[PDB]
Design a binder for this molecule. Structure first.
Ligand SMILES: O=C(O)[C@H]1CC(=O)N(c2ccccc2O)C1
Length: 358
């Protein structure tokens, strides 16, 4: 690696690992079309398995970027429209409160306060219909943003309905395979289990538990190499050969709503570059905990802005993930860890590395 990249990464990440007691970490810096990889510590403490460029980490809510892009691809295919009523793809959602709630609202957390989590009690598909039918919005659609799994999770499931493919099949066929993400999984196959890192919560080894709409909201697992490739694909979508996928990526980075300094895309979230870490942290949902914010509609949505800090945080019970890139500087970073550590620390470290290299 160029020494500047080596130095800034190691001098930032090593103290982070010490401070946060992170068992294992993988980092990719993408610089002008080139990835550079760095690994520390353990994927599995008990079995003394090191973190490599091949170990799988739970992305958690970074999965929402994949969901957003798949949704964008479906739009590009002419299969769905973000202006479509939710009921067009789920006509059994007949409860009145759903009148005026569009796929856009679901994708962007602006439906009127859909819950952050689907209850663990929701185990069947009839349970799921009951859940959405009985849900009572506190706000009119498109007035407030409330970050929620049940919102974008539903968007994901409905976005693939015209295709006739399962969410997993659609994601594999339309996003993973064309982008050569051959070690990215919604369900970790037996063949790749040796590479699947354990998460660590309160010193215990843990993996994400199954739940309703998990694949769509927080279910993707990936390597540092595939994630670097994912960032590069989103940094430079014009290089992508598949027309609808190229367009899908562009639609995910469109600015649909503004709350404070942050603009909501499909999965991705954006702020204007230059920006300081304290403004990024303030424009972030640091935990899955209620933060209701009035939104201003961007009418019509601004197409992907090159001078943006584009990012997403993710954190299952035992993992902490972060992805950020600045399109206009051909610069990106992926941070994958098998401990859920505070988001501000992730943002601080990512900014420190990217600011030095830009
Ligand atoms: O995005 C984040 O960093 C928070 C917010 C969120 O939805 N998280 C989350 C919650 C449940 C499963 C996976 C997750 O990533 C963690």
């Amino acid at each position: 690696a160029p020494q500047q990249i080596n130095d800034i990464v190691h001098r930032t990440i090593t103290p982070l690992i010490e401070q946060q007691k992170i068992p294992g970490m993988a980092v990719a810096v993408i610089y002008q079309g080139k990835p550079y990889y760095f690994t520390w510590g353990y994927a599995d403490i008990a079995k003394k398995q090191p973190v490599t460029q091949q170990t799988l980490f739970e992305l958690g809510s970074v999965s929402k970027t994949f969901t957003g892009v798949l949704g964008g691809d479906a739009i590009a295919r002419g299969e769905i429209k973000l202006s479509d009523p939710t009921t067009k793809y789920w006509p059994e959602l007949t409860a009145k409160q759903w009148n005026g709630i569009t796929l856009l609202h679901l994708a962007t957390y602006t439906a009127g306060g859909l819950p952050l989590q689907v209850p663990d009690e929701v185990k069947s598909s009839s349970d799921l219909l009951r859940f959405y039918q009985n849900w009572q919005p506190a706000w009119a659609p498109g007035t407030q943003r409330l970050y929620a799994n049940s919102s974008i999770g539903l968007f994901g499931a409905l976005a693939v309905k015209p295709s006739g493919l399962s969410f997993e099949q659609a994601m594999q066929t339309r996003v993973f395979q064309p982008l050569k993400l051959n070690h990215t999984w919604i369900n970790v196959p037996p063949a790749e289990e040796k590479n699947y890192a354990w998460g660590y919560r309160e010193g215990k080894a843990v993996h994400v538990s199954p739940g309703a709409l998990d694949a769509e909201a927080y279910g993707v697992k990936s390597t540092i190499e595939d994630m670097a490739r994912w960032v590069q694909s989103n940094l430079k979508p014009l290089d992508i050969n598949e027309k609808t996928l190229q367009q899908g990526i562009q639609l995910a980075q469109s600015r649909y709503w503004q709350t404070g300094d942050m603009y909501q895309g499909l999965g991705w979230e954006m702020l204007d570059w230059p920006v300081n870490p304290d403004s990024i942290i303030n424009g972030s949902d640091n935990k899955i905990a209620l933060a209701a914010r009035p939104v201003k509609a961007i009418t019509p949505p601004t197409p992907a802005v090159r001078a943006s800090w584009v990012h997403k945080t993710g954190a299952t019970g035992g993992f902490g993930s972060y992805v950020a890139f600045i399109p206009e500087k051909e610069l990106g970073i992926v941070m994958l860890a098998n401990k859920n550590y505070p988001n501000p620390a992730r943002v601080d470290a990512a900014w420190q590395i990217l600011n030095a290299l830009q």
